[PDB]
From a paper:
Aurora A is a serine/threonine protein kinase that plays an important role in controlling early stages of mitosis, including centrosome maturation and separation, mitotic entry, and bipolar spindle formation. Localization and enzymatic activity of Aurora A are regulated by its interaction with the spindle assembly factor [name]. We have used fragment-based, structure-guided lead discovery to develop small molecule inhibitors of the Aurora A-[name] protein–protein interaction (PPI). The initial fragment hits identified from screening with the ATP site blocked by a high-affinity inhibitor were very weakly active, but guided by continuous crystallographic analysis of the inhibitors in complex with Aurora A, we were able to increase target affinity by more than 10,000-fold, clearly demonstrating the ability of fragment-based and structural biology approaches to develop potent PPI inhibitors when a suitable binding pocket is present. These compounds occupy a hydrophobic pocket on the surface of Aurora A, discrete from its ATP-binding catalytic site, which forms the interaction surface for a linear N-terminal segment of the interacting peptide from [name].
Through a further iterative development of the inhibitors utilizing the crystal structure-guided drug design and biophysics (FP and ITC), we improved the affinity of our weak, millimolar fragments by over 10,000-fold to generate the lead compound [name]. In addition, the meta-channel between Tyr199 and His201 could be further exploited by the replacement of nitrile with heteroaryl ether, to give compounds 9, 10, and the lead compound [name]. [name] engages with the Tyr pocket through hydrophobic interactions at the bottom of the pocket and with polar interactions further outside. The indole NH hydrogen bonds with the Glu170 side chain, and the acyl sulfonamide stacks against His201 and Lys166. The pyridine ring in the meta position pushes Tyr199 sideways, creating a channel between His201 and Tyr199 and forming a T-stacked aromatic interaction with the latter. Finally, Arg179 latches on to the central aromatic ring, with [name] bound to a well-defined pocket which is partly induced by the binding of the inhibitor. An overlay of the crystal structures of early hit 2 with [name] bound to Aurora A reveals a remarkable overlap of the core biaryl scaffold in the two compounds. [name] displaces [name] from Aurora A with a KD of 19 nM and a ligand efficiency of 0.33. Our lead compound, [name], inhibits Aurora A:[name] interaction, binding Aurora A with 19 nM affinity. [name] exhibits oral bioavailability, causes pharmacodynamic biomarker modulation, and arrests the growth of tumor xenografts.
Residue numbers in the entry: 127 to 388
The structure:
């Protein structure tokens, strides 16, 4: 049982859809953590209060060094608070802005961590569905940590999400409003692997219009510097038909992953 009086609030770590994430310290233990704050009014208007308990319940029951931890949760008159593990090295998103693109070693490494964390999520039939650089956080040793379980659900699901932010990571099945499996996360893995190497996602467009078309048609191209091995893994992953998409063990054992991964 927790309350806001139990914490000292620091600076904002980042901005959320329904609030903001703050750096904080628990007074009793001196424990540093991140407090994800969600406004009740905003959540009510979206009718997503049910999905919040779902994000809460799913994340709370996951233990993995490559998965952001959820210590607890509490609420008051106006807000719902999520006591998260603090990731000191920020988002993968911020890293990509800095470096423009990652090398094959860095990419394969992040992909390995994603795949481990993902395979483990899928073992509980848990699908993330919001895999993207802003939701991939970095630990003290620079280890990839999956976060933002806001749109997570148990597999299979037919649930429709509050439209995009960027439609860029969603598979055609989710976009078409069709039923989806753990395959959604595999598609996202292909999008992420491409973005890390190229600096931008494979179906990126100026409009939601063009993006939907491109995702639907699976219409993307590789720049010349992309290695043949990277092309194979990405190509294997971006299958329109979910069944075609490989398992995580195949991904984890891919020669390119094994050659440049750590
Ligand atoms: C209006 C309201 C309440 C609320 O007032 N609850 S209560 O006081 O009346 N009533 C006793 C459950 C509660 C929530 C809510 C929705 C989801 C979560 Cl996870 C939440 O946080 C916790 C944490 C620990 C135990 C239970 N819930 C709170 C939301 C989300 C949007 N509007 C809300
Ligand atoms: N544990 C954390 N450590 C560090 N930064 C965090 C942490 N959790 C969130 N952030 C920052 O706050 C942003 C929003 O948090 P997130 O859980 O992804 O919210 P939302 O569901 O609103 O998108 C993140 O993308 C990141 O920039
Ligand atoms: O944690 C949140 O801000 C939200 C809870 C309700 C579902 C959507 C979710 C999100 O945008 O990640
Ligand atoms: Mg997010
Ligand atoms: Mg979210």
């Amino acid at each position: 049982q927790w309350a806001l009086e139990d914490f000292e609030i620091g600076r904002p770590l980042g901005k959320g859809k329904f609030g903001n994430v703050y750096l904080a310290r628990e007074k009793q233990s001196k424990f540093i953590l991140a407090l994800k704050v969600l406004f009740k009014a905003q959540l009510e208007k979206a009718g997503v209060e049910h999905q919040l308990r779902r994000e809460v319940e799913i994340q709370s029951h996951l233990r993995h060094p490559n998965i952001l931890r959820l210590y607890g949760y509490f609420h008051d008159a106006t807000r719902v608070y999520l006591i998260l593990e603090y990731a000191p090295l920020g988002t993968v998103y911020r890293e990509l802005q800095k470096l423009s693109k990652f090398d094959e070693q860095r990419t394969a490494t992040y992909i390995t961590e994603l795949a481990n964390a993902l395979s483990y999520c899928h073992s509980k039939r848990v699908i993330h569905r919001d895999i993207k650089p802003e939701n991939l956080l970095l630990g003290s040793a620079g280890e990839l940590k999956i976060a933002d379980f806001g749109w997570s659900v148990h597999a299979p699901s037919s649930r429709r999400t509050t439209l995009a932010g960027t439609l860029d990571y969603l598979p055609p099945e989710m976009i078409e409003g069709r039923m989806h499996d753990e395959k959604v996360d595999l598609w996202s893995l292909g999008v992420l692997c491409y973005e890390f190497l190229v600096g931008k996602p494979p179906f990126e467009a100026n409009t939601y219009q063009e993006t939907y078309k491109r995702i639907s048609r699976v219409e993307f191209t590789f720049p010349d510097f992309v290695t043949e091995g990277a092309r194979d893994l990405i190509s294997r992953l971006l299958k329109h038909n979910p069944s075609q998409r490989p398992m995580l063990r195949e991904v984890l054992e891919h020669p390119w992953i094994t050659a440049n991964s750590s």
